[PDB]
Amino acid sequence: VKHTAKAENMIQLQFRMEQMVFCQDQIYSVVLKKVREEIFN
Amino acid sequence: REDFKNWVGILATNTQKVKNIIHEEVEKYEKQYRGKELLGFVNYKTFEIIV
């Protein structure tokens, strides 16, 4: 029980983090994937 | 008409010239303004100010 509660809060916190749109360098690889799918193809 | 044909030449010439302005603006936008604005995407206010 002590650990099911640690576990249950942590999942909640990780989702609480993902409400913010945060952008980083690894988007270029997948912005190339748009040009692959929707423009070259 | 000689003058009005010249006026297209100025519009093209001036369209070459603004490239120094936009350049400086983009490095101001890069070092600040879209990173101020939570990281887009293209920003409209930088695009409005240059024109």
Swiss-Prot record, chain B:
Superkingdom, taxonomy of origin: Eukaryota
Subcellular location(s) of the protein: Cytoplasm; Nucleus; Nucleus, Nuclear pore complex
Record's note on what induces expression: By type I and type III interferons.
Role description: Interferon-induced dynamin-like GTPase with potent antiviral activity against human immunodeficiency virus type 1 (HIV-1). Acts by targeting the viral capsid and affects the nuclear uptake and/or stability of the HIV-1 replication complex and the subsequent chromosomal integration of the proviral DNA. Exhibits antiviral activity also against simian immunodeficiency virus (SIV-mnd). May play a role in regulating nucleocytoplasmic transport and cell-cycle progression.
Family (UniProt): Belongs to the TRAFAC class dynamin-like GTPase superfamily. Dynamin/Fzo/YdjA family.
UniProt-recorded name of the protein: Interferon-induced GTP-binding protein Mx2
